[PDB]
Inverse folding.
């Protein structure tokens, strides 16, 4: 049922590529008449023991998450393990905003914000920290529906602790990380809230490259990690997006509070986003 036969997974193309893994577009087609469903299939390529263990955790995490705003686990395929997910043909939200900017207004962006928030609220209820919340990792289900994706760096909190310390820092872009993550490798639901603030910045700049998080931080900026951390600890933040409502920018600034304790929860952000302009 949730076991997918290798021989019926017809490869079409690559969707994304990583250093130790890749995501491929396939049609699972048992009948062989091209009528079967399209699926996104993740697999490791020449990985080490550490990456295989993480991949086993990722599979079980995603398998247990049930939300309308999180990409759906479909099953597995077995020498080498493969993770089968639903396929969302509209692609990631970053490319979508850039491509369809003229068609999408501020109310649509707030709809996406609300749905991402609800997904993250649900993730926090499962004691799960995403660690890589960004517009590139949000998928478009339809023009009025987005889902959080890419659980490769996701980790569950310890049962009796609200934070997690990463030993070996995974090389993802520094401009979505909270201060404590950069300084001390501390991750939590509150560090995800920081990243959500950057997602709101991404949405309301329509993921424009010229004014991206990196581009704008680099303008404000001896090492790059040490300079970014120095800048944030002085209180310097990303600017208001030009086409952003005042109240939305105020919520971004609360998401970026220096102390994790002073940042609002996704449960407190949700109603604030939904009640805007009513
Ligand atoms: C014609 C151009 N087509 C696309 O540009 C396209 C279409 C669909 C697409 N979908 C993705 C993409 C990813 C993905 C990745 F491949 C690398 C890094 C991060 C993510 Cl979220 N993951 C999943 C999916 C999916 O449907 N289910 C899981 N991605 C790209």
């Amino acid at each position: 049922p949730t076991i997918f036969e290798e021989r019926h997974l017809k490869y079409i193309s690559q969707l994304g590529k990583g250093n130790f893994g890749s995501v491929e577009l396939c049609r699972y087609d048992p009948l062989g008449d091209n009528t079967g469903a399209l699926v996104a299939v993740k697999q490791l390529q020449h990985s080490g023991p550490d990456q295989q263990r993480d991949f086993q955790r990722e599979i079980q995490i995603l398998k247990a998450l049930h939300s309308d705003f999180i990409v759906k686990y479909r099953g597995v395929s077995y020498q080498s393990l493969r993770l089968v997910m639903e396929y969302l043909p509209s692609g990631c939200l970053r490319d979508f905003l850039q491509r369809h900017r003229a068609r999408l207004d501020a109310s649509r962006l707030l709809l996406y914000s609300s749905q991402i928030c609800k997904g993250m609220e649900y993730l926090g209820s499962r004691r799960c920290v995403h660690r890589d919340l960004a517009a590139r990792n949000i998928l478009v289900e339809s023009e009025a529906h987005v889902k959080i994706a890419d659980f490769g760096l996701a980790k569950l909190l310890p049962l009796d602790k609200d934070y997690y310390v990463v030993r070996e820092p995974g090389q993802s872009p520094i401009f979505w990380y909270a201060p404590e993550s950069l300084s001390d490798n501390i991750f939590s639901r509150q560090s995800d809230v920081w990243s959500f603030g950057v997602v709101l910045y991404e949405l309301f700049t329509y993921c424009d490259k010229s004014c991206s998080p990196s581009a704008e931080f680099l303008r404000m900026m001896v090492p790059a990690l040490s300079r970014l951390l120095e800048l944030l600890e002085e209180g310097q933040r990303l600017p208001a997006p030009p086409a952003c409502p005042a109240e939305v920018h105020e919520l971004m600034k609360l998401c970026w509070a220096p102390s994790p304790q002073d940042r609002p929860s996704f449960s407190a952000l949700g109603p604030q986003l939904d009640m805007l302009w009513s």
Notes: Residues 198 and 260 are 15 Å apart (CA to CA). DSSP finds nine helices and eleven strands in the chain. The two ends are 45 Å apart (CA to CA).
